[PDB]
Motif scaffolding. Structure first.
Motif, PDB file in Angstrom:
ATOM      1  N   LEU A   2      30.104  57.408  28.596  1.00 15.84           N
ATOM      2  CA  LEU A   2      30.109  58.399  29.659  1.00 15.84           C
ATOM      3  C   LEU A   2      30.888  57.893  30.868  1.00 15.84           C
ATOM      4  CD1 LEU A   2      27.507  57.561  31.857  1.00 15.84           C
ATOM      5  CD2 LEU A   2      26.277  58.151  29.781  1.00 15.84           C
ATOM      6  N   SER A   3      30.720  56.622  31.215  1.00 15.69           N
ATOM      7  CA  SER A   3      31.607  55.994  32.180  1.00 15.69           C
ATOM      8  C   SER A   3      32.902  55.592  31.494  1.00 15.69           C
ATOM      9  CB  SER A   3      30.949  54.774  32.800  1.00 15.69           C
ATOM     10  N   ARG A   4      34.022  55.794  32.187  1.00 18.70           N
ATOM     11  CA  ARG A   4      35.338  55.550  31.612  1.00 18.70           C
ATOM     12  C   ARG A   4      35.919  54.294  32.228  1.00 18.70           C
ATOM     13  N   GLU A  11      48.069  47.608  29.518  1.00 19.44           N
ATOM     14  CA  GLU A  11      47.826  46.188  29.736  1.00 19.44           C
ATOM     15  C   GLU A  11      48.761  45.597  30.786  1.00 19.44           C
ATOM     16  N   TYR A  12      50.007  46.064  30.848  1.00 21.86           N
ATOM     17  CA  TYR A  12      51.049  45.359  31.585  1.00 21.86           C
ATOM     18  C   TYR A  12      51.181  45.893  33.002  1.00 21.86           C
ATOM     19  N   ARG A  16      52.565  39.896  42.371  1.00 20.67           N
ATOM     20  CA  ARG A  16      53.123  38.666  42.913  1.00 20.67           C
ATOM     21  C   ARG A  16      52.017  37.779  43.474  1.00 20.67           C
ATOM     22  N   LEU A  17      52.400  36.547  43.815  1.00 20.67           N
ATOM     23  CA  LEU A  17      51.461  35.552  44.320  1.00 20.67           C
ATOM     24  C   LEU A  17      50.790  36.006  45.613  1.00 20.67           C
ATOM     25  N   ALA A  18      49.476  35.791  45.681  1.00 20.24           N
ATOM     26  CA  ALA A  18      48.697  36.161  46.855  1.00 20.24           C
ATOM     27  C   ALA A  18      49.055  35.280  48.043  1.00 20.24           C
ATOM     28  CB  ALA A  18      47.204  36.052  46.551  1.00 20.24           C
ATOM     29  N   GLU A  19      49.027  35.882  49.235  1.00 27.26           N
ATOM     30  CA  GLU A  19      49.378  35.256  50.520  1.00 27.26           C
ATOM     31  C   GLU A  19      50.753  34.585  50.516  1.00 27.26           C
TER      32      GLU A  19
ATOM     33  N   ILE B 187      50.686  42.464  26.530  1.00 24.76           N
ATOM     34  CA  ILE B 187      50.337  43.822  26.131  1.00 24.76           C
ATOM     35  C   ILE B 187      49.853  43.867  24.691  1.00 24.76           C
ATOM     36  N   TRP B 194      41.532  44.136  21.344  1.00 31.14           N
ATOM     37  CA  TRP B 194      40.717  45.334  21.482  1.00 31.14           C
ATOM     38  C   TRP B 194      40.495  46.046  20.170  1.00 31.14           C
ATOM     39  CZ3 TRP B 194      37.834  47.441  25.313  1.00 31.14           C
ATOM     40  CH2 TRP B 194      37.986  46.922  26.596  1.00 31.14           C
ATOM     41  N   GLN B 249      51.306  58.527  30.684  1.00 33.12           N
ATOM     42  CA  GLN B 249      51.007  57.321  31.454  1.00 33.12           C
ATOM     43  C   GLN B 249      52.117  56.286  31.327  1.00 33.12           C
ATOM     44  OE1 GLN B 249      47.186  55.615  30.579  1.00 33.12           O
ATOM     45  NE2 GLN B 249      47.338  54.073  32.198  1.00 33.12           N
ATOM     46  N   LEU B 356      34.661  59.431  21.095  1.00 34.18           N
ATOM     47  CA  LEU B 356      35.097  58.062  21.125  1.00 34.18           C
ATOM     48  C   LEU B 356      35.702  57.680  19.790  1.00 34.18           C
ATOM     49  CD1 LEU B 356      33.358  58.021  23.810  1.00 34.18           C
ATOM     50  CD2 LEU B 356      32.659  55.792  23.064  1.00 34.18           C
ATOM     51  N   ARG B 512      58.939  33.469  40.729  1.00 30.75           N
ATOM     52  CA  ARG B 512      57.724  34.045  41.324  1.00 30.75           C
ATOM     53  C   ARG B 512      57.457  33.542  42.742  1.00 30.75           C
ATOM     54  NH1 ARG B 512      56.518  38.492  39.095  1.00 30.75           N
ATOM     55  NH2 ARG B 512      54.291  38.353  39.617  1.00 30.75           N
ATOM     56  N   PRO B 722      53.971  36.896  54.628  1.00 33.81           N
ATOM     57  CA  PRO B 722      54.802  36.657  53.446  1.00 33.81           C
ATOM     58  C   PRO B 722      55.200  37.959  52.781  1.00 33.81           C
ATOM     59  CG  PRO B 722      52.882  35.238  53.441  1.00 33.81           C
ATOM     60  CD  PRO B 722      52.653  36.257  54.504  1.00 33.81           C
ATOM     61  N   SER B 725      52.755  38.942  50.042  1.00 36.50           N
ATOM     62  CA  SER B 725      51.520  39.571  50.497  1.00 36.50           C
ATOM     63  C   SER B 725      51.700  41.065  50.676  1.00 36.50           C
ATOM     64  CB  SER B 725      51.058  38.944  51.807  1.00 36.50           C
ATOM     65  OG  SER B 725      49.936  39.636  52.315  1.00 36.50           O
ATOM     66  N   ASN B 728      52.447  42.737  47.106  1.00 36.39           N
ATOM     67  CA  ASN B 728      51.340  42.815  46.156  1.00 36.39           C
ATOM     68  C   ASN B 728      50.400  43.953  46.523  1.00 36.39           C
ATOM     69  OD1 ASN B 728      49.600  42.275  44.083  1.00 36.39           O
ATOM     70  ND2 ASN B 728      48.870  40.322  44.897  1.00 36.39           N
ATOM     71  N   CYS B 747      33.689  59.576  37.148  1.00 27.98           N
ATOM     72  CA  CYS B 747      32.688  59.034  36.240  1.00 27.98           C
ATOM     73  C   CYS B 747      31.470  58.494  36.977  1.00 27.98           C
ATOM     74  CB  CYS B 747      33.319  57.982  35.350  1.00 27.98           C
ATOM     75  SG  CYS B 747      34.204  58.750  33.987  1.00 27.98           S
ATOM     76  N   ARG B 750      29.684  61.556  38.429  1.00 27.33           N
ATOM     77  CA  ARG B 750      28.948  62.284  37.415  1.00 27.33           C
ATOM     78  C   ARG B 750      27.698  61.519  37.030  1.00 27.33           C
ATOM     79  NH1 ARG B 750      31.789  63.125  31.828  1.00 27.33           N
ATOM     80  NH2 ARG B 750      30.919  61.043  31.544  1.00 27.33           N
ATOM     81  N   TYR B 893      21.994  55.736  31.335  1.00 29.17           N
ATOM     82  CA  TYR B 893      22.540  56.080  32.640  1.00 29.17           C
ATOM     83  C   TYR B 893      22.480  54.923  33.615  1.00 29.17           C
ATOM     84  CZ  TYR B 893      23.207  61.197  32.366  1.00 29.17           C
ATOM     85  OH  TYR B 893      23.653  62.465  32.081  1.00 29.17           O
ATOM     86  N   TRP B 896      25.425  52.542  33.213  1.00 36.94           N
ATOM     87  CA  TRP B 896      26.737  52.922  33.699  1.00 36.94           C
ATOM     88  C   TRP B 896      26.753  53.332  35.151  1.00 36.94           C
ATOM     89  CZ3 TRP B 896      30.123  50.989  30.736  1.00 36.94           C
ATOM     90  CH2 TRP B 896      29.835  50.854  29.388  1.00 36.94           C
ATOM     91  N   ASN B 900      29.812  51.363  36.814  1.00 39.01           N
ATOM     92  CA  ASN B 900      30.791  52.009  37.683  1.00 39.01           C
ATOM     93  C   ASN B 900      30.671  51.555  39.125  1.00 39.01           C
ATOM     94  OD1 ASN B 900      32.223  53.673  35.941  1.00 39.01           O
ATOM     95  ND2 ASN B 900      30.705  55.313  36.116  1.00 39.01           N
TER      96      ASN B 900
END
Ligand SMILES: CCOc1cc(CC(=O)N[C@@H](CC(C)C)c2ccccc2N2CCCCC2)ccc1C(=O)O
Ligand SMILES: Nc1ncnc2c1ncn2[C@@H]1O[C@H](COP(=O)(O)OP(=O)(O)OP(=O)(O)O)[C@@H](O)[C@H]1O
Lengths: 19, 1177
Positions: A2-4, A11-12, A16-19, B187, B194, B249, B356, B512, B722, B725, B728, B747, B750, B893, B896, B900
């Motif tokens: 029920l929760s999604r 996945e992808y 970038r690096l924090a701070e 990926i 999964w 998506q 599902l 990076r 930076p 910062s 991101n 969700c 609900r 319930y 979740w 959530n």
């Protein structure tokens, strides 16, 4: 799941690096 | 931990009570056992492939072979999570059956058959069977995760163990770069992990459908067959929306990725843009990209306001189809309350698996793809199976065509050997082949120094710097000895790099981090080879890459002394032939083959020598600043009221459902159930749409405010804060407040509102449930409090661990040949097994804290099952089935709501980051004059007079300039240079009102420069900085984006500097796309851009800065162009780093230590006068 925080993840992301 | 406590995760309770007082470091969640290691599971996976490759006559590791290997290695733990999953589900079925029994023996008043003829006794065997549904479910949740996490461990290794054997050819490494193989680890491996998280569900969910069909049929009949058909015929249209979502998506991600590159160009080049009054232009360039990204996120929002809708609406329509069909079509055994309030729980169970099930089969397809991707990777090119080469035929093509053949190279010990030849003579290729990285078609490379190989230092031509400290990039996992390091730092001149760095030896260097100058990057790489004390050094063109000229001299003078004293043989290929016949036992190759080998005198005797002669705080302020500020009341109140009214209808649909079953007024029972369930369905649509709509309207007006109040910031902020910062919080927090918050918001809004609703149903069914709920709620409060505090810490400790792992899978791939050259495989191997085991031990405790919550919260919920049952029966002998079918949901319930709540809290903290950026603003644009009548058509007189201006940056104790007086008259082209650390860069920037002249007056063209709008000032006075970069775009657009002057003028301006030949003979011309960093025009082109901006602005004044390191011929050409720029302008106040270009001046101001040291009105008296000549010499 029920929760999604489901298993349909984009996945992808770039963070970038924090701070 | 024993079976009594491993199933309830009792060992977490001593870990979460400490995690509340202190925080969680990696030293708190530290130890990682033998079974859950990356190495152990990798040893298990090698055994699996070995026993297969013994068993398999058919050789390769195809996708069939990997799945057999994974099954044979991980079957014995997957069966224990599918057996526990089948039993958790089947015992879960008993819960509906018990509801049927309770209500039958309620209302209207062998010994074991009467034992289950009760409602007191049947609640206890309901309660003491839900404790087994809720413990077996978790046991099979955890075993799936633990086995799944292990595959992360032993596939990232078994990927990395081929990175230790991949061939760096132009075929293999040219096709797949580091970006391809990093998304295999990042990926791809996650979506194979999964799959093993969801691997029992594709086994279990078919049982659920079969029993769900059978028990619903026994409870209600052939009408249940019609009802469960409507779910299973709306599961494929659940799939279509879930397919179209992920399609959209990917579009949104690959669109905002292009936005982030544009935002990187604006933040990295905000210095030159702000000085040229070009912040607004790039702002409106990223905003139109945001328009197109917003129409892509709109389609994401449309296809995710259906996923929520289909999840809720499809069962309710199915349930109404069941009963109304069981009432309208044929009612034989009508809805007695034991039948109806029990088959609601059978549907309320089968809500969850069928919708599902669409997303399981999705994640089975992705697993099939992933072993396709991984097996196509895992059949790449292996590498192979002092230096004396006899025949030497070696190729980069894995069949035929040697790039170097007939290579007979001899290099015995105690040596120093240069290698020189044409650019493209097989010279860099000879060193890499000598190191053992190219396929010997014929010959052999032999070895005996201090089969059997040798560790060899290596410097790549394209230099490689690991993301670490500059000292640590130099040390390179070797014992620090500050005498060797001291000699290296001086020799490569690392002292100016350390001082110019924000940190020095602690500075994050390479990729990076600080993207250093190409020569500076080369100096860092060159030093590592010298430092390392390896038994042989191979330098591939350090001198040909040597940017600093005296250091290039000093490099050779250090490398001679180092090679001679250490007696470490050195092969240094270069085509700078300064030392080449002196004392190098040189080995010259030509056109891919060795041309001559011998002593230097032999090459003097071969007549080619003549050629050489030529932390605990929630954030309600950020949540209030999110919703009420950005969204507005006109849809905040509609969302907040539709949530409550959708959630009062869900009790009204159930309350009236109870009051019909008592009668088992029949067409009025039908006409209110249809007209409640239909409006219940209708409100599902208009709350699922209004949640996602509010997300889009807050994402827009956050990002638009964030951009347009960071392009209103001073450049002193950009040097103080930076650029990692700002970027991101820019990039990642906007992804969270677009793609991740509103789904969690819907969700959570609900779930927790339904949670209070379910506990409202219980408390009116047994109206002294308030006594029952007050102690139990307190325990629910405490588990809530100690879970958020815990699993925030392990959340970021998960995420901040994944990034040093995938950065290791970048740095292994790019600087690969260095690691194999030092024979250094097993020491970047072990850094993985620390990085892998730091991610699994912070993901296991994340999931064990997740399971600790669920075991503990469900036991709280199971107490609600027994107490709601017991107190309602003892009341109803003096709407009980509907109260009892809600108590089952409450156990799922409370989970979740907490889950959530933690996730929303973590996501909400990404809004406080953006509002911290939105409180940083300065550098006003006010013109305190008659703002259009007092400035005339152009201030271009050139009369820049300084009256005692005292300017600074630190604003506290440290000025840069004091008491300065200089009045360059119109035409007084007075190139002013002074002491090299004193004030020169500050002088140039401050002239554009970008620094705090805390006193005095600086008049320009008869107008005070402090009393002009910054847009007016910065546009009407051009500049050219030290060594800038290029904005990617059209060439006229790059030269002048908001030009509106002419095209002929643009051609005249571009030709007047240089590069008009390359501009005209480019494949584009005047709309030529600048290829992402300016890798194809020049450094002169920046001067051309400055010349075009100067001419188009029709000014006379110009302030021009220095030049870093380039062709001095091009710099004399630039100086001549500056003379040509003078022979249009005749006024310029141009600083310079090297004073020998600044010796052609018309007045000169020499500044020392941060004051005015000299002001020589001619530039020739400066040679006579001692202070100025001392700076001149
Ligand atoms: C890291 C993943 O950790 C888990 C892994 C699992 C195993 C599992 O079947 N998962 C998916 C199901 C798929 C089909 C959406 C899921 C994911 C998130 C939330 C709930 C669920 N469903 C579980 C099955 C029943 C209804 C809800 C369970 C729970 C967790 C967890 O720690 O949250
Ligand atoms: N992995 C590879 N696969 C195929 N060809 C390669 C590979 N690496 C390099 N080459 C080619 O072989 C040549 C090797 O170096 P080259 O003959 O140019 O000596 P060099 O001029 O001293 O080296 P460079 O020009 O790179 O400084 C390069 O010109 C390149 O075109």
């Amino acid at each position: 799941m029920l929760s999604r925080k489901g298993i349909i993840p984009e996945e992808y992301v770039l963070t970038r690096l924090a701070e | 931990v024993n079976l009594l406590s491993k199933g309830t995760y009792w060992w977490m309770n001593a870990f979460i009570k400490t995690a509340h007082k202190k925080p969680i470091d990696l030293r708190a969640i530290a130890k990682l056992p033998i079974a859950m290691r990356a190495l152990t599971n990798y040893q298990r996976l090698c055994v699996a492939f070995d026993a297969q490759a013994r068993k398999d006559t058919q050789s390769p590791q195809g996708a069939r072979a990997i799945w057999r290997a994974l099954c044979h290695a991980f079957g014995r733990r997957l069966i224990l999570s599918s057996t526990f999953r089948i039993l958790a589900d089947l015992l879960g079925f008993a819960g509906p059956l018990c509801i049927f029994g309770i209500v039958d023996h309620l209302g209207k008043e062998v010994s074991s058959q009467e034992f289950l003829g009760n409602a007191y006794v049947l609640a206890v065997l309901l309660f003491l069977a839900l404790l087994l549904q809720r413990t077996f479910l978790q046991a099979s949740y955890y075993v799936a995760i633990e086995t799944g996490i292990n595959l992360r461990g032993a596939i990232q290794t078994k990927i990395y163990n081929k990175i230790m054997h991949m061939s760096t050819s132009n075929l293999s490494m040219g096709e797949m770069t580091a970006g391809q193989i990093c998304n295999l680890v990042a990926i791809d491996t996650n979506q194979l992990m999964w799959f093993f998280f969801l691997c029992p569900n594709l086994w279990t969910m078919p049982v659920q459908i079969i029993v769900g069909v059978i028990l619903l049929y026994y409870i209600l009949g052939v009408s249940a067959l019609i009802g469960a058909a409507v779910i299973i015929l709306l599961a494929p249209v659940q799939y279509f929306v879930a397919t179209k979502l992920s399609q959209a998506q990917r579009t949104t991600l690959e669109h905002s990725n292009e936005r982030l590159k544009q935002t990187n160009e604006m933040l990295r080049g905000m210095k030159l843009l702000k000085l040229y009054a070009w912040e607004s232009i790039f702002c409106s360039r990223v905003e139109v990209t945001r328009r197109k990204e917003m129409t892509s996120l709109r389609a994401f929002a449309v296809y995710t306001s259906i996923s929520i809708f289909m999840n809720t609406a499809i069962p309710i329509a199915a349930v109404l189809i069941t009963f109304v069909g069981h009432v309208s079509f044929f009612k034989e055994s009508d809805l007695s309350p034991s039948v109806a309030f029990a088959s609601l729980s059978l549907f309320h169970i089968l809500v969850t698996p069928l919708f599902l099930l669409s997303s399981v089969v999705r994640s089975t397809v992705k697993a099939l793809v992933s072993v396709q991707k991984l097996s196509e990777f895992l059949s790449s090119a292996e590498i192979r199976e002092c230096v004396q080469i006899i025949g030497g035929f070696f190729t980069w093509t894995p069949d035929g065509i040697p790039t170097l053949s007939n290579i007979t190279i001899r290099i015995p010990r105690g040596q120093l050997t240069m290698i020189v030849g044409q650019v493209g003579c097989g010279k860099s290729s000879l060193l890499l082949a000598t190191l053992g990285e190219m396929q010997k078609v014929s010959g052999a490379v032999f070895w005996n120094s201090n089969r059997s190989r040798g560790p060899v230092a290596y410097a790549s031509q394209k230099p490689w710097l690991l993301n670490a400290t500059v000292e640590e990039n130099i040390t390179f996992e070797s014992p620090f000895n500050k005498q060797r390091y001291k000699m290296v730092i001086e020799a490569c001149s690392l002292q100016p790099d350390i001082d110019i760095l924000p940190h020095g030896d602690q500075t994050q260097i390479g990729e990076r981090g600080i993207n250093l100058s190409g020569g500076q990057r080369q100096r860092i790489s060159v030093a590592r080879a010298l430092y390392q004390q390896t038994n042989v050094v191979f330098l591939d063109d350090p001198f040909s890459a040597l940017d600093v000229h005296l250091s290039d001299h000093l490099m050779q003078a250090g490398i001679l002394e180092l090679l001679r004293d250490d007696k470490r043989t050195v092969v240094l290929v270069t085509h700078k032939l300064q030392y080449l016949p002196h004392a190098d036992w040189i080995i010259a190759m030509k056109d891919g083959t060795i041309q001559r080998e011998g002593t230097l005198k032999d090459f003097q005797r071969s007549e080619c020598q003549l050629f050489e002669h030529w932390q605990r705080a929630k954030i309600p302020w950020r949540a209030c600043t999110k919703y009420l500020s950005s969204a507005g009341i006109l849809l905040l109140s509609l969302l907040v009221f539709s949530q409550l009214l959708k959630h009062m209808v869900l009790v009204a649909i159930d309350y009236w459902l109870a009051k019909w079953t008592d009668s088992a007024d029949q067409s009025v029972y039908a006409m209110v159930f249809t007209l409640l369930c239909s409006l219940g369905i209708v409100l599902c649509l208009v709350t699922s749409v209004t949640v996602e709509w509010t997300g889009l309207k807050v994402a827009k007006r956050l990002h638009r405010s964030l951009l347009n109040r960071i392009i209103l910031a001073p450049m002193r902020f950009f040097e103080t804060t930076p650029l990692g910062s700002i970027l991101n919080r820019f990039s990642s927090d906007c992804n969270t407040i677009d793609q991740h918050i509103p789904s969690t918001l819907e969700c959570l809004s609900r779930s927790t509102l339904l949670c209070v609703s379910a506990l409202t149903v219980i408390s009116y069914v047994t109206p002294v449930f308030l006594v029952a709920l007050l102690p139990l709620a307190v325990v629910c409060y405490f588990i809530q409090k100690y879970f958020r505090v815990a699993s925030r810490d392990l959340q970021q400790l998960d995420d901040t661990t994944q990034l040093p792992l995938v950065s290791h899978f970048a740095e292994t791939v790019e600087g690969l040949t260095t690691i194999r050259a030092f024979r250094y495989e097993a020491r970047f191997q072990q850094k993985l097994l620390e990085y892998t085991d730091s991610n699994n031990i912070a993901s296991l405790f994340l999931t064990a804290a997740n399971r600790w919550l669920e075991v503990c919260m469900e036991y709280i919920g199971a107490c609600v099952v027994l107490i709601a049952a017991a107190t309602s029966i003892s009341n109803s002998l003096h709407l009980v089935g509907l109260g009892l079918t809600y108590a089952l949901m409450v156990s799922n319930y409370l989970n979740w709501m907490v889950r959530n709540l933690a996730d929303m809290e973590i996501q909400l903290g990404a809004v406080k980051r953006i509002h911290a950026l939105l409180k940083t603003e300065a550098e006003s644009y006010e013109g305190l004059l008659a703002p259009s009548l007092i400035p005339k058509n152009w201030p271009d007189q050139g009369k820049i007079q300084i009256q005692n201006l005292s300017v600074r940056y630190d604003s506290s104790l440290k000025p840069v300039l004091k008491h300065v007086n200089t009045l360059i008259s119109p035409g007084q082209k007075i190139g002013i240079c002074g002491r090299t650390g004193s004030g020169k860069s500050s002088f140039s920037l401050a002239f554009f009102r970008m620094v705090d002249m805390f006193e005095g007056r600086i008049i320009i063209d008869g107008i005070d420069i402090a009393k002009l709008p910054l847009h007016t000032l910065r546009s009407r006075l051009s500049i050219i900085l030290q060594d800038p970069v290029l904005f990617s775009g059209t060439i006229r657009f790059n030269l002048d984006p908001e030009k509106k002057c002419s095209d002929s003028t643009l051609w005249e301006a571009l030709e007047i500097a240089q590069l008009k030949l390359v501009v005209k003979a480019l494949p584009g011309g005047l709309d030529a796309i600048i290829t992402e960093g300016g890798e194809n025009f020049s450094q002169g082109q920046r001067q051309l851009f400055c010349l075009a901006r100067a001419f188009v602005r029709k000014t006379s004044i110009f302030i021009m800065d220095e030049a870093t390191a380039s062709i001095d011929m091009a710099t004399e050409n630039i100086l001549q162009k500056v003379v040509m720029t003078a022979f249009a302008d005749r006024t310029v106040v141009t600083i310079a780093h090297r004073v020998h270009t600044i010796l052609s001046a018309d007045l000169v101001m020499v500044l020392k230590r941060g004051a005015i040291l000299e002001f020589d009105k001619p530039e020739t008296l400066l040679s006579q006068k001692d202070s100025v000549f001392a700076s001149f010499v």
